[PDB]
Symmetry: D2
Subunit: 260 residues, 4 copies
Amino acid sequence: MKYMITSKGDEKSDLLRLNMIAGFGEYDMEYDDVEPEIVISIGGDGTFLSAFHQYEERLDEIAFIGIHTGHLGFYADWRPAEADKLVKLLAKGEYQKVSYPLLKTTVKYKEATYLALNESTVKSSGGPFVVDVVINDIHFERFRGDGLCMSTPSGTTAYNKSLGGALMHPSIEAMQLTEMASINNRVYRTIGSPLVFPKHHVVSLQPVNDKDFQISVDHLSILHRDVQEIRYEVSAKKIHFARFRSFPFWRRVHDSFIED
Amino acid sequence: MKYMITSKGDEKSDLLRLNMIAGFGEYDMEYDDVEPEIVISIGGDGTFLSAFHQYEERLDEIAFIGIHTGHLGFYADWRPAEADKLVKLLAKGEYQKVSYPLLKTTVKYKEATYLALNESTVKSSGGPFVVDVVINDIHFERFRGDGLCMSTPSGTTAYNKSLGGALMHPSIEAMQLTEMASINNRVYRTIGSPLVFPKHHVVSLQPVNDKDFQISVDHLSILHRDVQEIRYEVSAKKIHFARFRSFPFWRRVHDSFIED
Amino acid sequence: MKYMITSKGDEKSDLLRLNMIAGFGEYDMEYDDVEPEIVISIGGDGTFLSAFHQYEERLDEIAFIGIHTGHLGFYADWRPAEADKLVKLLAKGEYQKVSYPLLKTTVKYKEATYLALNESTVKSSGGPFVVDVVINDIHFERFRGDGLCMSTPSGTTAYNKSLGGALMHPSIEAMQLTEMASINNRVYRTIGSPLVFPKHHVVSLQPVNDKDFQISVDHLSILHRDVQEIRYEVSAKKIHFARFRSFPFWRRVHDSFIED
Amino acid sequence: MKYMITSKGDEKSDLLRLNMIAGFGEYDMEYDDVEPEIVISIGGDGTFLSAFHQYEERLDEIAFIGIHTGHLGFYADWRPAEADKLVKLLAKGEYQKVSYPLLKTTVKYKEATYLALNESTVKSSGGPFVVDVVINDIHFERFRGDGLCMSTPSGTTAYNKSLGGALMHPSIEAMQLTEMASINNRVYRTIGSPLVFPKHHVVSLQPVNDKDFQISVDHLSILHRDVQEIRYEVSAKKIHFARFRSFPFWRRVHDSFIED
Ligand SMILES: [N-]=[N+]=NC[C@H]1O[C@@H](n2cnc3c(N)ncnc32)[C@H](O)[C@@H]1O
Ligand SMILES: [N-]=[N+]=NC[C@H]1O[C@@H](n2cnc3c(N)ncnc32)[C@H](O)[C@@H]1O
Ligand SMILES: [N-]=[N+]=NC[C@H]1O[C@@H](n2cnc3c(N)ncnc32)[C@H](O)[C@@H]1O
Ligand SMILES: [N-]=[N+]=NC[C@H]1O[C@@H](n2cnc3c(N)ncnc32)[C@H](O)[C@@H]1O
Ligand SMILES: [N-]=[N+]=NC[C@H]1O[C@@H](n2cnc3c(N)ncnc32)[C@H](O)[C@@H]1O
Ligand SMILES: [N-]=[N+]=NC[C@H]1O[C@@H](n2cnc3c(N)ncnc32)[C@H](O)[C@@H]1O
Ligand SMILES: [N-]=[N+]=NC[C@H]1O[C@@H](n2cnc3c(N)ncnc32)[C@H](O)[C@@H]1O
Ligand SMILES: [N-]=[N+]=NC[C@H]1O[C@@H](n2cnc3c(N)ncnc32)[C@H](O)[C@@H]1O
């Protein structure tokens, strides 16, 4: 199986990458960073996020595996000390594929579409942020505040969590919208609560005054001008993970937030 | 079709019930509060909750309809002034069935099982509340605080919402666990965030010291003694609603929380 | 100086108490649990709370000191291993007095008044909790939910904190009101935010329907019937601590919540 | 008494300003926008904020009055229809002065100091925001998240409120620090809770990596580079309001958030 290895780029990760490549050379495994079938990310979640976006055009033909040489490393399944065992199991091909839902963001001015593994957020390009929130064509609320965050299930443990959102098991095909510092008084009103949307539900954001927004997709933050609308929906595309052992989402959550 | 009508029991609701019964008499519709196929609740959500629990043994053979003579009336689809039109449409049989997921609660000492339309909560029988939270057999956290709330999708707009939980579209077969005043310090740690569980996931609560708990299921609150565990899962059973017109969940939410 | 020592009552604490008493016997220090000038609490915050309430009638003539043989021990200034040094310093009389504000609760039916070091809360005697919140005679809100919590500054790190309240430095003579699971929809509205009141401000709770409430003052929970109103204000009374060394409130907070 | 009038600048406000000036001309009142003793702001809170900052160098010699021609208008005491009565009372000099505490922000690179009526916030100049929070020289926490907000008492109803902060009566000389989307996991830890600091307490923010920050003071947002630290304390300066009638803070809060 063709494979490639991304590295955090520090001494630890680069060296681990070289040793794994050496180990793969001992098997019938070809290194290909153009059309790999397996992508190994060595680092933290930032590194993993980069790996995903590097191959967001071949998500259907790739299974990802993360090795934790970072700090938290939520998307990682392996410790550096287990790298050799990983090489072996990957060789023998003893693994099952697991899929997590992704978030599709469409920005219309022309249209640009982005794919997110964690979340997509919107803020003002400086100045007051005000947007009408439209759900399946029904006007739901006019949001005034710092911004909004739309999260995938696996992303609910990231930015979403910090914003008071619920943690959502990845087997649920959904997206979750959370508020950033909503204004609520006699005249201005938002739902307040995070909202969880099923697949096939469309959430659209529509400018009220200012049409310039800072839009983020995972680690990438882009300024969009003359925006007509931002549209969120659960992507038809899924990220696939290669699992060689049981590591339940809730245990992953426990280890990352309660105690490791 | 056999039908029955529950009433809030005030002047307004009783009279509306009598007029509807009269209207039904003009059709080939038999009133039967033993084995009805349609249950009409006239009142608020409290009244609707009572109706559901009165027939929780025949949920598969019943479609519910709510008329709003209460204050908020979230589960209601009709205003009193539309009662006549409702009678007519019910007669002609022009309606489609819609299903919402329910929550199963099992209390083991012997075992008692309850079914919830909104939520099930647990608190201490007076004194400190401490329980181990076990998800699919994995020990997730030890919860210290006032109590916990497990909500259905349609219940997420109720108690769940007040506790900071996410609002969850009823098409998502899930349950959501929220905290009540969790203690979090150097020594005590909880996830904090609401947790959303898919169908077939089991959340079990296990006593640490005190074994006596006050357990609520919707409007019903019962004291259980010598409790060994409380087990939550998404019920295989669903409540069925009779819909004669489009009234999307998110519009229902908008009307109840943003503006009517 | 007359002194008394309260003990958690476990093996560790009782023995520590005996050794300290022995050490005090070597000085001109008389043990008196009737009219002591110094009260030493050996245990956790629960033990300290008990000590305070045991002498809430002589708060003006007493300085408290806590020794930590409990788990968290927020009000404690000493570790068991330092007991000998404490005995010595207490003997030589090398210490300065520090005062924290207290909360006065008045319950009218006849009137009963309670004094709180941490907080006073109100909940329903079973059933729905609804009260009108009146601030300095002006009707502020009608609260529907689980209950309310009124906290002292030093109490803001306790129950108050779990309810989303702000942490408040004890030098600020104030009380803070937090909500428990307030209902907020189209028809029901509360402020949501914690409220911080200065000295001489009076917050009164007035029943809307049910007149029976469960009222807590620190560790004590009492059911009151035929309640006409509950009145909160910053007490004119203060608790005095004996400080032999610098241990700033914010460091106390850091040690208890961030890292020890 | 010398006076000046700021205007929102719309048709309504400008015309109201002209009529008031005409009314003042009928008395011995001189219009002076250089060294006025009374500053009347006609508009919303944004307009009022601008008025305050226009004369932040003469806060000791000025009493402010707001007229509400805006939307919410929290700092306003008057409706446009009462302008004539205001002119009269201002003439006869029938009013009492009321003072609210202010927030001092010091930015060191050289030093710049700003004065805030509502709040001062800090965010990253793009990229991750990380700062060490130092309280009175003691290292309290390392904050990772979107940013921080330090609010005056009267400012607690603004940005502070949206961030989950407590509402604080203006008679309390304090400042309140709230978090924006703090990261909290196994490795990263913040207090979470808003913090309320008394006068003479100093809160300092110190860069960990990036030294560039976006710093806001009320409506003004400035990018600072090569920042060594940001220092917050309760200002020795106070804003003075001219009150011609009783309008308690808590009633002001009720009217702005509960019902007008
Ligand atoms: N800001 N930020 N990101 C830093 C934290 O987010 C973590 N992170 C990124 N993605 C996730 C994620 N999906 N779940 C939990 N934590 C995550 C990353 O590892 C850092 O600990
Ligand atoms: N790992 N990493 N970096 C990208 C992630 O940063 C996360 N992030 C950014 N800001 C915050 C934040 N304030 N809290 C938690 N996570 C955050 C977000 O989830 C992005 O996917
Ligand atoms: N406490 N309580 N219940 C009172 C409010 O809860 C409302 N309620 C009950 N069930 C729901 C519900 N599912 N969604 C929203 N509100 C609900 C009920 O109508 C009252 O307005
Ligand atoms: N309608 N009704 N009564 C039953 C509902 O009361 C709701 N409830 C009880 N306490 C609260 C509460 N504090 N906030 C919101 N809802 C609440 C809960 O959802 C029950 O299903
Ligand atoms: N529930 N409860 N109480 C248990 C926790 O509250 C702690 N506690 C009591 N009073 C305070 C307090 N004032 N500040 C912080 N923690 C406190 C006590 O030590 C336990 O850790
Ligand atoms: N130590 N102790 N026991 C009494 C304290 O318990 C605290 N307490 C009770 N319930 C909670 C709670 N849910 N969270 C935090 N603290 C709590 C409250 O502050 C009382 O003063
Ligand atoms: N974002 N923003 N500001 C808009 C809202 O904040 C309001 N505002 C400004 N200052 C305060 C304030 N101090 N209290 C309450 N609301 C305030 C202003 O009137 C707008 O309604
Ligand atoms: N009026 N006005 N504009 C300035 C105020 O905007 C307020 N503000 C900015 N963002 C928010 C926000 N997200 N929520 C509430 N208030 C906000 C803040 O209090 C400033 O003083």
